[PDB]
Ligand binder design. Structure first.
Ligand SMILES: *[C@@H]1O[C@H](CO)[C@@H](O)[C@H](O)[C@H]1NC(C)=O
Lengths: 441, 49
């Protein structure tokens, strides 16, 4: 038997309903999300890390000169410094005082820390949405499975065939570009590969951490060696990766809306409370019992004994009843006014039972369904004592949930006052116009 | 669970109340004063004899 509905995208809050098949007693259905995961499709653009500058031994040409040639190295530099007269532990290196040349070379390469400490630049597109569900129905206990939130892929959970529809919202916390550094994800608009600027995030770019083709853009400039000293001095813009780590700011992990939790393997946003989830679950035919085979419940009277519109199950009600066969009976409130804690109760030949519920309404008025029967519960609720709680609300507040009977009286009086008063003027106008008509006639 | 009230300044007469906590059965509370003492601050000015 197919049951279709739409449930909110709330993890940890159960969806409860009765599966009503004509000719069979209703079967209570409960579906709870364990987690919801938005898994975007990612494409690694390049890898950024702190650069290392490689400086080969300089060529010191005594009584002569040499020339630089280009080489295929990242940010490669080469400069010939003439007129040098270097000294070492053994004294003057060269004989000639001025006919003396030093050629310096330098280039950029990935640092050794790049194997562990690097940032990954990803292009992010839409992708699969997955969720894990916890499902019960009738006498069947909790069963769970990982499902695809696409409306097409069925899942077999406790012999029931579940199809979960697409989310009502296409929202995703990831922009078209993200940077993954450690466990954190950043919505950073990184420069495209080959366009990085010195001192900024993309100054060093590599397609992979093992790539033999490295892009580097730093102001690596060879400086003239100090007089009499053999070394290869240079100036360079400080690494933009280290600069970025200082200024990277708040990660997506800390600023994502809707309470999203960000995970990296695979990159995904978890438990985002966005929109609703259309669903379709096929309850096995063997789970249904004929009407005549179940207990008959009548003479129902519902009394609310306690009520606070707190986020917890602050309401308590007692239901008096008479029933045949003294069996088990599902309990459900189809109205959005109150969420029932109990799923079913054990009935005697006659007596009463209690149940707990959560409601935002200051004056609850809801229909409680008792297998094959129903009763209306009405009452008043007190305000909660705790200003702040560490758990989410079990109920959904509506527009009129806060309106008290005193407030409704005032609203009705103001509306009734103007309605009657305006109509009186219109009635008076219609009558006087007729009176003038009969004066002429 | 905090219960606030005003009781008369009487010794030997108990203050009785039911502590009503939402969702829980009421707890009877009885507060009685055994003695009350006003202890002023004094400075000895001098001793006469
Ligand atoms: C399903 O709900 C029951 C409630 O008692 C819980 O024990 C079980 O672990 C839940 N399943 C999952 C996968 O969390």
């Amino acid at each position: 038997y197919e049951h279709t509905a739409v449930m909110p995208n709330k993890v940890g809050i159960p969806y409860k309903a009765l599966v009503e098949r004509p000719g069979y007693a209703p079967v209570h259905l409960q579906i709870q999300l364990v987690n919801t995961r938005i898994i975007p499709s990612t494409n690694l653009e390049y890898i950024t890390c702190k650069y290392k500058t490689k400086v080969p031994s300089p060529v010191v040409k005594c009584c002569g000169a040499t020339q630089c040639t280009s080489k295929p190295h990242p940010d490669y530099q080469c400069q010939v410094f003439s007129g040098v007269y270097p000294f070492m532990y053994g004294g003057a290196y060269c004989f000639c005082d001025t006919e003396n040349t030093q050629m310096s070379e330098a280039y950029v390469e990935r640092s050794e820390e790049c194997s562990i400490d690097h940032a990954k630049a990803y292009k992010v597109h839409t992708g699969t949405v997955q969720a894990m569900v916890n499902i019960t129905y009738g006498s069947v206990s909790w069963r769970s499975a990982d499902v695809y939130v696409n409306g097409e892929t069925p899942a077999k959970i406790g012999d029931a065939k579940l199809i979960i529809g697409p989310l009502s919202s296409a929202w995703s916390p990831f922009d078209n570009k993200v940077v993954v550094y450690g466990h954190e994800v950043y919505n950073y608009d990184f420069p495209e590969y080959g366009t990085g600027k010195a001192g900024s995030f993309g100054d060093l770019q590599s397609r992979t951490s093992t790539s033999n083709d490295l892009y580097a853009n730093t102001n690596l400039k060879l400086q003239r060696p100090q007089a009499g000293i053999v070394h290869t001095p240079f100036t360079q813009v400080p690494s933009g990766f280290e600069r970025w780590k200082k200024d990277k700011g708040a990660p997506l992990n800390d600023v994502a809306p809707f309470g999203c939790s960000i995970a990296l393997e695979p990159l995904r946003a978890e438990n985002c409370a966005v929109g609703s989830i259309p669903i379709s679950i096929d309850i096995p035919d063997a789970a249904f019992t004929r009407i005549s085979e179940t207990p008959t419940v009548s003479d129902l009277e519902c009394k609310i004994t306690e009520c606070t519109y707190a986020f917890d199950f602050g309401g308590i009600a007692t239901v008096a009843y008479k029933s045949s066969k003294a069996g088990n009976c599902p309990i459900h409130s189809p109205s959005g006014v109150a969420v029932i804690k109990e799923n079913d109760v054990t009935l005697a030949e006659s007596g009463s039972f209690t149940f707990h519920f959560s409601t935002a309404n200051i004056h609850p008025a809801f229909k409680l369904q008792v297998c094959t029967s129903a009763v209306t519960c009405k009452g008043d609720c007190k305000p909660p004592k705790d200003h702040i709680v560490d758990y989410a609300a079990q109920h959904t507040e509506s527009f009129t949930s806060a309106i008290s009977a005193t407030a409704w009286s005032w609203i009705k009086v103001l509306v009734g006052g103007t309605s009657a008063f305006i109509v009186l003027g219109l009635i008076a106008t219609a009558v006087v116009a007729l009176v003038l008509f009969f004066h002429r006639h």
